[PDB]
C-alpha cells in the first residue's frame, strides 16, 4: 500500500524542468525550480510505450535564490513520487502518489491515500495521468 | 584536435541547473535555463577525484518563455561541451571547449580553439576548471 522511497533517483534520466515563481497560481506549494526524473520503466511509458509496474517518476522541487539576474538552486523543498502498480494503486489510476519533505525518506507527506494528488493528475487520464512530455 | 559531439548526453547524470535571465553579465550568449550533465568519467572529478581523460561535461541551454510567472523550457539554444584530454587539449589546460548550435553536431560555435572559454574557466583552476559542484 505504500510508495517506496525512490533510492538513487538523482542517477535517473532527467525528463524536463520548469520554474514556478511568485505570482503563478501554483506558487504555493509548487513554487521553485523543479526537475522531473524517470527510471527505465517510466522511460518506456514516456516514450509512448506502456508504463510497466515498477515505473517511477519523481518531481524534485528546489527553493531558489535570485542572484544578479540568475535564479540559483537552493535547498530541496520536497520530492513528489508516482510509482506504477496497476492492481495495488487501482484507487488512484494505477499510480501511487507520495511526497517526501526535503526529499527525506523519514518525512512522508500524503495523508489521504493520494486522492488529492490524483484529483489534479486525473486531468491527464489520456497520457496515463502524467503531465510531463519527453523532450530532446 | 576537435571536441567530439557528446552523443547520448541526455541519458547522462544531471549535475545541476541554473536560470540566467536578461541583464545577467552572461545573457549573451548563455541566457536561458541550463542543465549540466556529466558522463561517468566526469562524475569521478566532480566527487573529488582527478578528471580522467574522456570526462565530458555538457552545458545544455534552453530558451524559455515566461507565462504567468512560470519559466517554461522552449527550444534548445546550444550546448557547451568540455572534453578532458590532458595531452590533446594542453593549450586550454587539458579540456577541449566546443559549442554546438541547437545541440546539433554540424553547428560548431567555437572559432578561437576555445581560448575565450578557457579564459573564464581558468578562474576555477583549483577545481580543475569546472564551476559546477555536485549536489544531492
Ligand atoms: C495540480 C494542482 C497538481 C497537484 C495537486 C499535484 N500535481 Fe503533480 N504535477 C502537476 C503538474 C502540472 C505537473 C507537471 C510539471 C511539469 O514540469 O510539467 C506535475 C508533475 C508531477 C510528477 C512528474 C510526472 C508528471 O506527471 O509530469 C510527479 C511525480 C508528480 N507530479 C507527483 C505528485 C504528487 C505525489 C502529488 C500529491 C502530493 C502531486 N503531484 C500533486 C500537477 C499537480
Ligand atoms: C565566464 C565568462 C564563462 C565563459 C566565457 C564560459 N563559461 Fe562555461 N561556465 C561558466 C560558469 C559560471 C559555469 C557554471 C554554471 C552553473 O550552472 O554553475 C559554466 C559552466 C560550463 C560547463 C559545465 C561545467 C562547469 O564548469 O560547471 C561547460 C561544459 C561549459 N561551461 C562550457 C563552456 C564553453 C564550451 C565555453 C566557450 C563556448 C564556455 N563555457 C565559456 C562561465 C563561463
Ligand atoms: Zn540588474
Ligand atoms: Zn515574472
Of B45, B47, B38, the closest CA to residue B94 belongs to B45
The percent helix, strand, coil of chain B (3-state, each to 5) is 20, 35, 40
- How far is Cα B105 from Cα A50, in angstroms, rounded to an integer? 32
The bound ligand whose nearest atom lies closest to the alpha carbon of B132 is 2
Structure obtained using = X-ray
Which residues from B are below 8 Å from A69, CB to CB?
Answer: 20-24, 27
- State in Å: Cα B129 to ligand 2 middle: 9
What values do phi and psi take at A124, rounded to 5? -95, 25
Over the range A66-93, which residues count as b (16 or more CB within 10 Å of their CB) and which as e?
eeeebbbbeebbbbbbbbbeeeebeebb
Q: How many CA atoms lie within 13 A of A92 on its CB side?
A: 25
Which residues from A are below 8 Å from B14, CB to CB?
Answer: 10, 14, 35, 37
- How far is Cα A14 from Cα B101, in angstroms, rounded to an integer? 21
Residue with cell 538523482: A10
- How far is Cα B84 from Cα B41, in angstroms, rounded to an integer? 9
- How far is Cα A102 from Cα B44, in angstroms, rounded to an integer? 26
Residue with the nearest Cα to atom 11 of ligand 1? A131
Residue B95 · residue B83 · CB < 8 Å: yes
Cell numbers given for B14: 544531471
Which of A14, A22, A136 minimises the CB distance to B35? A14
Its domain, for residue B103, covers 1-136
Is the Cβ pair B68, A22 closer than 8 Å? no
DSSP state of B49: S
Residues in contact with A45: Cβ distance below 8 Å, sequence separation at least 6, in sequence order: A51, A52, A55, A84, A128, A130
Ligand 3 (ion): residues with CB under 5 Å are B 23
- How far is Cα A10 from Cα A6, in angstroms, rounded to an integer? 9
- 3-class DSSP state of B91: helix
What values do phi and psi take at A118, rounded to 5? -65, -35
Calculate ∠ Cα A99-B133-A102, nearest 5°.
15
Cell numbers given for B17: 541547473
> In A8-126, at which residue ranges do the beta strands (DSSP E only) sit?
13-20, 32-38, 56-66, 70-84, 95-101
Which residues from B are below 8 Å from A37, CB to CB?
Answer: 14
Residue A31 · residue A71 · CB < 8 Å: no
Cβ atoms < 10 Å from Cβ of A33: 24
DSSP state of B127: G
Length of chain B: 136
Residue B34 · residue B17 · CB < 8 Å: yes
- How far is Cα B128 from Cα A103, in angstroms, rounded to an integer? 30
Number of domains observed in the structure of chain B: 1
- State in Å: Cα A59 to ligand 1 middle: 7
Cβ atoms < 10 Å from Cβ of A114: 24
Amino acid at each position: 500500500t505504500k510508495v517506496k522511497y525512490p533510492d538513487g533517483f538523482r542517477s535517473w534520466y532527467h525528463v524536463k524542468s520548469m520554474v514556478i515563481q511568485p505570482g503563478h497560481p501554483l506558487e504555493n506549494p509548487f513554487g521553485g525550480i523543479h526537475h522531473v526524473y524517470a527510471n527505465a520503466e517510466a522511460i518506456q511509458g514516456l516514450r509512448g510505450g506502456n508504463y510497466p509496474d515498477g515505473a517511477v517518476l519523481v518531481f524534485d522541487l528546489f527553493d531558489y535564490q535570485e542572484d544578479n539576474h540568475a535564479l540559483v538552486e537552493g535547498k530541496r523543498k520536497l520530492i513528489g513520487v508516482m510509482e506504477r502498480d496497476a492492481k495495488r494503486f487501482s484507487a488512484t489510476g494505477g499510480w501511487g502518489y507520495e511526497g517526501f519533505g526535503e526529499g527525506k525518506p523519514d518525512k512522508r507527506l500524503v495523508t489521504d491515500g493520494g486522492q488529492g494528488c490524483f484529483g489534479c493528475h486525473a486531468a491527464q487520464k489520456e497520457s496515463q495521468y502524467v503531465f510531463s512530455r519527453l523532450r530532446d
